[PDB]
Amino acid sequence: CCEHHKAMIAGLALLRNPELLLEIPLALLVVGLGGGSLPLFVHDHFPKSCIDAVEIDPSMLEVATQWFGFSQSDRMKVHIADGLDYIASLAGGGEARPCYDVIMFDVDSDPTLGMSCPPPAFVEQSFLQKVKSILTPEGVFILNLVCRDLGLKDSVLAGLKAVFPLLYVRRIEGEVNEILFCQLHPEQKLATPELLETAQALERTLRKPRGWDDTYVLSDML
């Protein structure tokens, strides 16, 4: 919906054939709910997506559920937790631990900190190792970054690249935010023409206007 959300969703083009993308299950972890529009968009446009959303503030979930059309279902669950704690627990799950195709950080907090979007702990290298441990090998880690301190920004970017050696960057028109798209295997990266092709294919489907709501039919039938 908003410009930085459209850019984050665009990162799904780094996964695989965008024809296939709608037609196959996709596991997505999203940290930071806001008004719910980002996970709601994915839920509504990708009928086989399974989303875990982590949100620190129960009031954000309350308002989104009461007034902004957000809801939980079998395919979209919200956990009230600090994303740092939540990812640390998931990463400690053993061979049982989850494996997400996509991890999105849309987290924005404390004015004290040297950056608030995300808080710096989310991009510290020992935490980034926990993120890597719950991502599929060919998955994508997508980060909304606001960092006006350019010295800090270079340190953040260097640390990200140390753990995710394939980095792409999108600056957003009319705002300071940039979206980082982080992957694990630079040798498998798409050539520029392929990069262009996959993006255009994704946007064609998401603009296409459709469907049937199959939820909660049993009450009416019985």
Author numbering: 470 to 578, 580 to 679, 681 to 693
Task: Reproduce text from the manuscript describing this model.
Here, we report the identification of human METTL13 as a dual MTase that targets both the N terminus and Lys55 of eEF1A through two distinct MTase domains, firmly establishing its function using a combination of in vitro and in vivo methods. METTL13 harbors two distinct predicted MTase domains that both belong to the 7BS superfamily. The N-terminal domain (here denoted MT13-N) belongs to a recently discovered enzyme family consisting of likely KMTs15 and the C-terminal domain (here denoted MT13-C) lacks close paralogs, but is distantly related to spermidine synthase (SpdS). During elongation, eEF1A performs the essential function of delivering aminoacyl-tRNA to the ribosome, in a process where the ribosome samples the available pool of ternary aminoacyl-tRNA–eEF1A-GTP complexes.
To obtain further insights into its molecular mechanism, we determined the crystal structure of its core MTase domain (residues 470–699) in complex with S-adenosylhomocysteine (AdoHcy), which is a byproduct of the methylation reaction, representing the demethylated form of AdoMet. Based on its sequence, MT13-C belongs to the family of Rossmann fold-like 7BS MTases, and, correspondingly, the determined structure of the MT13-C MTase domain reveals a classic 7BS structure, consisting of a twisted 7BS sheet surrounded by six α-helices, three on each side. Although the homocysteyl moiety of AdoHcy was not fully resolved by electron density, the MT13-C structure indeed revealed that residues in these motifs (Gly503 and Glu524 in METTL13) are involved in AdoHcy coordination, and show a similar positioning as in SpdS (in complex with MTA). Moreover, MT13-C and SpdS share a short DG-motif (Asp551-Gly552 in METTL13) localized after β-strand 3 and not generally found in other 7BS enzymes. The localization and orientation of the acidic aspartate residue in this motif allows hydrogen bonding to the primary amine of the adenosine moiety of AdoHcy and MTA, respectively. For SpdS, two aspartate residues (Asp173 and Asp176) in Post II have been shown to be important for both tetramethylenediamine (putrescine) substrate binding and efficient catalysis, and interestingly, MT13-C has an aspartate residue (Asp575) at the position corresponding to Asp173. Also, the other residues of motif Post II show a similar positioning between the two enzymes and MT13-C, in particular, also has an aspartate residue (Asp577) in spatial proximity to Asp176 in SpdS.
